[PDB]
Design a protein around this ligand. Sequence first.
Ligand SMILES: CC(C)=CCOc1cc(NC(=S)c2ccoc2C)ccc1Cl
Lengths: 534, 416
Amino acid sequence: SPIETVPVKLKPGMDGPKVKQWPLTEEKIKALVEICTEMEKEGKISKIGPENPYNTPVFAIKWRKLVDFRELNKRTQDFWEVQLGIPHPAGIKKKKSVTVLDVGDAYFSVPLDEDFRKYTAFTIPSINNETPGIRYQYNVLPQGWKGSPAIFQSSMTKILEPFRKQNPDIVIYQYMDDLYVGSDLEIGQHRTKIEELRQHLLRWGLTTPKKHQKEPPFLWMGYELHPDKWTVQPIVLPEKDSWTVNDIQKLVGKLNWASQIYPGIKVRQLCKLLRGTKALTEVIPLTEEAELELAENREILKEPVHGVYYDPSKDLIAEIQKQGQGQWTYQIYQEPFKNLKTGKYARMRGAHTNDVKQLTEAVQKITTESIVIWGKTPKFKLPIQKETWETWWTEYWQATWIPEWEFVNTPPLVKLWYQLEKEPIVGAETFYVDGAANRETKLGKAGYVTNRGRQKVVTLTDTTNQKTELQAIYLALQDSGLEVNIVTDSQYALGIIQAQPDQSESELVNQIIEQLIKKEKVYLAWVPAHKGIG
Amino acid sequence: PIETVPVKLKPGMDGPKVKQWPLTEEKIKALVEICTEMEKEGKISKIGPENPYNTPVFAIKKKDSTKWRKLVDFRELNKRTQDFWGIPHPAGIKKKKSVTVLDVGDAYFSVPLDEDFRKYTAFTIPSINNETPGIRYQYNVLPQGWKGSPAIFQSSMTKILEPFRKQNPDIVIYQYMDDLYVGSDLEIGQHRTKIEELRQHLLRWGLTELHPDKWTVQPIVLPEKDSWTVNDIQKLVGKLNWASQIYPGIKVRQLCKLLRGTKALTEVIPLTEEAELELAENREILKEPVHGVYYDPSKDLIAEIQKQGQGQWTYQIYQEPFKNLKTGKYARMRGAHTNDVKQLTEAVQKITTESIVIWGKTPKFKLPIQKETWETWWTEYWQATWIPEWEFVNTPPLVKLWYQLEKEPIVGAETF
Ligand SMILES: CC(C)=CCOc1cc(NC(=S)c2ccoc2C)ccc1Cl
């Protein structure tokens, strides 16, 4: 072609590949000898001679051909990332017409930096490793070579510039060997322009085909794309009578992907089947509950989920629900009930945190996503009162934020499970708690003594020092009335005061939190340990 | 329109390969414009895929403009770029009544960049939803935000300034990145007017309110109370005890003897004469910054920030723990009430400029924010040509409680 080549080079100080030509039968050689005389005439390759010390093994599977560039590739320089981030159905706009042009064969239509070609040398074996084999090399981007994807696209980009300029109201998406061309022109004008494009391309040697011709809807990321809207490619759950772990994991994976689009999907009981499995091929019988939810899911999945595309002229709204502790669901739409996208985030589990914090996190993940999809952030409708937000955030130790949002009374609402008092409680009993353990024998004591004369101690075995300290706080909570002042020298209690977590990785802390939540007033105070403090 | 100087990366260093972070539509539209223009003006050229480097780029709205400015994050490239051993720090700059900052980044485009170094300036304009490939460019001229620009352009900058410097030798001019910090004691009126005089001058080539003498270092003020309760003393003792890591003469022995017994948290305690004096000696120690603290040009400058709440923030600049070079409080700027990120951002910029004015270098920040929160939004409120380094931390409860104690004005900074 008359396309300028891209200057390619080998990684820092490496030399081209020298892997020996795998041995083949006469049937396989006569076939490759065939295919290569073809490519050779199509200008795709060039018979070279002894002036080449490089080589790549050529194979023959059906009689087609396959060149293994694993070696050349590992020696080839790196190119700037070839579009790895693809479009999401929720972000594209509806089109009157969309046509996909298979410019696949164009892979072998783009010239290869003449200087680099020598490295693509390969050998068609001899009938019996007797006489010298047939030597060749590529003049174009080799199928399976590292720089082909990047170079093919950049080349496609240059070529498409003029056309793109001349036809602003026409969108062309380049992906792999395809060109999805969309537009809002009358179908005849569209068809006309596709032909103009097809020709323009033809001008650069890029020939595109009615038979292979692809038509809408299109399969993309698990959606079926129609010009006016999208649908989810129906997902089928293999009804079986013998489930191995592989079957069960794969299943859970697909169900996991479905929870994004379909409401009510559940895998809790199916995941239970994975416990203590001794091998992938191990057959695990489905419990009753597993047989059950796997049944409801088959149903939920029979429901047709359809969607809509992005209309720039309308608002972008994002609604969030708290389907359980740490679990969040959301749907983004412009017009009520016509979603662009939906999804949910894996149960957020951490060392220690709170629901309002988690919320802001779900909010930032959506925002990061939205900026990518629409280059704008959705207006949020959150299940939390503006007061709850103002109270929490304005005082939290960590910087946090939520873009423009509005409250929506869709229970369950996210709230503050408790709030430590800001000042000691007059008239409330004051527990002076303390815990201590031998870090090596794991033996400890936990207890308290109050200004009111109440006291208690407990001996613990196989415990840690932090646990005794917390258990001391726990007992105080357990044994006090609705209002209590608790003083401790526990450094961990210092974190609890600052962060006021409503969820933790520590079961003990969680037990403490359940107590905190239950009290009407709790003042937690910290003092340094080993002082004149009694 | 001159010859170019051979620049290289530090030995063993390869070019940046930083991913472009996602941009809003507005931001992308502005860059496309700004970039086709510079392309036409020959300042940048589209590049191939054979160039593997990349640097994040984005757009800001500098003070007073609806026009977007292209801002590139050359932090990575800067660190990789060789050294030029710029100008030493004019210690005097930090002692001026008034200091004004000027953006002279536009002077660099008038200078060609070594062709051999261009590959490394590769940047990419993303596309919404990835429907269009990214628009790859690289620079042909000195870029704003790259440490090499103010360096190479030093000789030309000094020349163009001498006249003003001599006409006004009582004025100090220090350049940092794309910035120029002009400091003088002239009254605000004769100052700002003297600035434009400099502008006009600086202007005839192609170029277009700080008070260092008021960045006083503040003392910790321990509470004084008519009557003290068990809790008051405890809160107190805990802070003082922490504080003893800075001032070893601070003691809570006598006070902790009052915390003997299991009395109610709200019960009043009589302060023994020993306790009384103990507090007095402590208040005296805290009457001044700890001795022996000197800045070290060979050390990294650190800037820690704590969120105090209600739009309040505290920071400390040090190189070694508990040996602050400076500390202070920061109140949110009007129109930022509901935005933690905007407030923090504004603070980072304020502290960095101070750090620049004082030591002529930026501090590495310890920020009380989650990485994602910051990365998602800091750019929306950024206005400086430079970008400091940062790390995300968890604020220790005590550090916040201690600096919460700093002294504030009797009334404030009064002016009708
Ligand atoms: C992601 C993908 C393969 C899209 C092509 O299919 C469609 C694309 C659009 N609308 C847009 S904005 C368009 C047209 C060509 O390329 C794009 C990205 C609408 C419907 C379908 Cl069926």
